[PDB]
Amino acid sequence: GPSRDVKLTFAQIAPPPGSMVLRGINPNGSIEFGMRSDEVVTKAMLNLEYTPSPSLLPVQSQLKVYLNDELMGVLPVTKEQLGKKTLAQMPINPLFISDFNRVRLEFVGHYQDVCEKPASTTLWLDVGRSSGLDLTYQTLNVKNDLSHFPVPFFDPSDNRTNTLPMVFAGAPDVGLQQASAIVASWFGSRSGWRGQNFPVLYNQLPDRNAIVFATNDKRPDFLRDHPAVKAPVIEMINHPQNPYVKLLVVFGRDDKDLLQAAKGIAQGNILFRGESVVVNEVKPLLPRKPYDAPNWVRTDRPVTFGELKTYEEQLQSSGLEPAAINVSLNLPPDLYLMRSTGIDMDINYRYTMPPVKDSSRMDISLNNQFLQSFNLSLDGKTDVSIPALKLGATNQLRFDFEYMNPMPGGSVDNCITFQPVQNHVVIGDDSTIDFSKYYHFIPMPDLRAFANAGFPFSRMADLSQTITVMPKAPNEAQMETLLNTVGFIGAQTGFPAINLTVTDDGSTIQGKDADIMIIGGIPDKLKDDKQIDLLVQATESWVKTPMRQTPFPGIVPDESDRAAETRSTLTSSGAMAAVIGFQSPYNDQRSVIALLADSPRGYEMLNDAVNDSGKRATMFGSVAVIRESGINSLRVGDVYYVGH
Amino acid sequence: GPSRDVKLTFAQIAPPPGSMVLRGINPNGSIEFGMRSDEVVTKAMLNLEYTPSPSLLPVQSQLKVYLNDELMGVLPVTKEQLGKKTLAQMPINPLFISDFNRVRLEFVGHYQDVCEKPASTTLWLDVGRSSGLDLTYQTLNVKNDLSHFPVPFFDPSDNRTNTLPMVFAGAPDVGLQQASAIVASWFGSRSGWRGQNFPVLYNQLPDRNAIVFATNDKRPDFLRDHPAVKAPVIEMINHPQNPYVKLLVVFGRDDKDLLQAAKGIAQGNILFRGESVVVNEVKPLLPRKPYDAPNWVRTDRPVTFGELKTYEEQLQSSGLEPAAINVSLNLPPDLYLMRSTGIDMDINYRYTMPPVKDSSRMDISLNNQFLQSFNLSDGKTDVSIPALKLGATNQLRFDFEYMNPMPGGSVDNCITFQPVQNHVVIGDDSTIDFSKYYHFIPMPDLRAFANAGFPFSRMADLSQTITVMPKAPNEAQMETLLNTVGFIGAQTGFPAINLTVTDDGSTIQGKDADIMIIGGIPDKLKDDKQIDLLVQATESWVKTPMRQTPFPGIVPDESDRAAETRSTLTSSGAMAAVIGFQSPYNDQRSVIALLADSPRGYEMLNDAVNDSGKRATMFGSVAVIRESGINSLRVGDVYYVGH
């Protein structure tokens, strides 16, 4: 079977800073990696480029490698490697590996053997960011059972961006488009932060796990002599060229049957069994609530920290120096602070009584911004008022415990020291955080929330109040960008779009209360609003520039730094994509976000910018222009507030 | 491609104390540099001529060399070189170099082993300012794509002056002059504090990247083969001799199309695509308000610290000794307060609560001068800044001075530990009022012009600004015009797009706008009243204002600033005269004249206007720039601008 040779380095598995330093207080460095439970590793090796300390002793210092609680090897320090950068090759036995492994490097060092100062900064060993673990994956044969779903298509263990191409049969219909969008949104919600890309190709066949859409009419070229189905059925067959890649052929009589199948897949994914699964009836019971997403916190009532734990071992730490506890809480980017009172949180922290009252403080930080420090000299219910002014869509709350332990040293001749004792730190699980007093009222025309959270469309979980307009007979690129943006919206939230509406005519939205989404060409029905700032055409394009451009604006905007100063029009022969956001001419409380290109290369740029989270989270303002030189954003046009 | 050896001394890249000392509380010494993004660094080595402390332990004390959090090598101190001067060269791996690199040196020291105490002045390692980085840049070939604009001409990762020569077609008319001035203003505004220089050549291709201006009738050299165009196009072609340098060719049917192309390049440059960009329609919607410049602070509303960061972690610090938090305020030089109460600001600082009140404080200072102090024993303090040094640019520095009352045990039992760090943060919500001021100042001086360009930069777009130029100017006068326009544009944050370049004095008669004389003073001017330093290329006369006292009062006096003697003399050298006076047509408008007597004088004037060290030392109403520097004096009548 096929076997790839991936060589992951130390710059994408190690902490953000990269090169880690192994001191005496934190001598453990862990890097995590896993396989998709289908491919088997072979010929795995670890290359370490470390530079020991010139002070530590040669033989009494060593670097231990632990794959999973098993010492794979021990590299000692020699007299020549005392202060020189040395390359060490460590073999990794491909037998103790599992679905998820954490290679842990532990460094022990001793510079003095008589009166060594524990936790001294003279001893250190830092691995280089050029290190890497080279391992080859070999693909095995899948059992071909729909019970394991979506394991063969999408495995949550893989950290690489999910690549799931969808193959239509050319010129999708109205129902087929919305069903494919539902499936893509479900896959994006299943993926999450991993990032998802759906390369769509018509009447072709890739060499990767794909999804084949069939409706008993306009079937792909290779779905020949297949019997018609009475009800929507989902069958998992193999590729005819090679049996080492599994497809997903969804069937149905008409577009409505395929939509029912997609709804059953997105919702009833827990009843999948065997190989073929027939859907017969799917009906809801009650609608969803606004601003209610599984990934977003509950703003209606205070939520405990127990509902904000990714793993059970998040709210506890140990060791000579207790590490900082980091918690993530996603919330909608509509929190507007009116009374400047902030949020009130009660932290029920339990700590260790220090030997002396030396103020082993504890600090709370929000996005690397110190909020307040509490003395430490044992649960305490403190009412912490957070002066929150930069609460966006995603943040990170850090509780650090700066422990300083005085150790009796004695005198010059009477050198006596004590080894450090480990301190246990735990945050109270009953601790709560309140977000009820925060209101929902913000400037609408900004798309920073759209790129970070998708707020304009993600008002409700199932996207009921959203209408996406598509051009007649879409090509590959238009459907590709549609699927990509729908999957991104679904991943930013926690629930897929089940009640989304797709239309091919631009006059069908006249008189409806919904958020309009333009994917291809802006229809002439609403193009006359003139609030659309940047328009991309075959070769011409005109943009409007504001009066003042500030890198960091204030909390409340002003009508003086957003008015269009000059309008510049020009034409060229290059590629350029545009992301614009304006007010709908049919309602004063809804918005329209349009992603538009002109050429296939522009669509490719738009897809590369939307799929990747590095280039997408760097846009703000009202308008964004994506070109070969990345993406440039500007805040032009009048501002209109949304909310109450 | 050509290789240029570069030696960056430690003086021009480190903070301006000259040298850096690495103590036990501040062992981090940082050095920032950048890469042009179109060149690759090869054979980079770091030299260090440092002195350690003699009380250091030889093996248990070393220094690191981190390049973007990557240890290139560690240097220990041997017993023989414990107190002596130590020179060491370390090879730097060019693979980890990026657009903006920060080399941080960390020093670890241990003078004792059983009872060593931090914050002690017995252990130290100081690097002299004789060291520097030795690296050889190697240019590459860009993709010739206009989407990366103005990347090949101006990179935000550079630190040296941006020399951008502009090749015209010879004897440019008013339209070409105005277009070149607009382009130079835009480039200077994009550059900013990096320094701007715009040499001009006629039918001479330069070595560096340049901009070519064409008209389809007076075609310059090496462009006769290019076919005629139907509309103003912007194309970036390669230099025929050496392709590693790029030239920006601007075409147009006539001067009006060239001006339109320049206006489009200035404003509509965010959507350049591929190559040969055709600009057709560039029209404005509404005019610009006075005192509306991006770099200058907004006076219509109270301004917060969020709009004055220009950074990400400027309002916060950490470590044992929290570094000072500096915020720069760029105010216009036209500010007058009769109430004399001073501007009030609402500081919302917060800090780490120390264990016991030990008189740890925070000092707020302005222009490197102590202003106020607050004890740390989390607030909305109203601080009234006395307006005594508020000029055109300043620096507001909050320095959190701490001292930790850490115990040390008894004489027979000394305790050991590691000192804890403390974080400080101001918060991007502290506002400062600036609407309680008026715009009324006596303006015969040149300090506001040299520092901010006030009389001409009242409107960021230079709408009411008339610059005269001689008939068929040479390279020197055009260079002077381009340089002064670029400087005015860089002091502000908006390109001068609506400036008016004229050639005859008939347009000056009956027009409400400031005057900028470059070539020479016209006949209607230089009436020998309120005008000094008339240089007829042979002799010159200067007036002494009866007194020359450094550091005058805030409000100037009229008894001292009065002409006493008119000394006339003929010489054989070269001089440049900067003269500021009042226009006879309008009382509010003013006339600034930058003139020279000889080509060497024009060169000295261009050099003075280009740099910034010799420009900040210019004040008064008259400035004479000779081969021995610039000397200024305040003479003439006083006229007030403002209501």
From Swiss-Prot, chain A:
Which residues does the entry place in the Periplasmic compartment? 1-644
* UniProt-listed GO biological process terms: cellulose biosynthetic process; UDP-alpha-D-glucose metabolic process
Question: Where primarily located?
Answer: membrane
To which pathway does this protein belong? Answer: Glycan metabolism; bacterial cellulose biosynthesis
Describe its membrane topology: Single-pass type I membrane protein
Where in the cell does this protein reside? Cell inner membrane
Q: Which domain of life is it from?
A: Bacteria
Q: Gene Ontology cellular component?
A: plasma membrane
UniProt keyword list? c-di-GMP, Cell inner membrane, Cell membrane, Cellulose biosynthesis, Membrane, Signal, Transmembrane, Transmembrane helix
Subunit composition?
Tightly associated with the cellulose synthase catalytic subunit.
What more is known? The genes bscA, bcsB, bcsZ and bcsC are constitutively transcribed but cellulose synthesis occurs only when DgcC, a putative transmembrane protein regulated by CsgD, is expressed. Cellulose production is abolished in E.coli K12.
Q: Briefly, what is this protein's role?
A: Binds the cellulose synthase activator, bis-(3'-5') cyclic diguanylic acid (c-di-GMP).
Q: Which family does it belong to?
A: Belongs to the AcsB/BcsB family.
Name the UniProt record assigns to this protein = Cyclic di-GMP-binding protein
Its gene name is bcsB
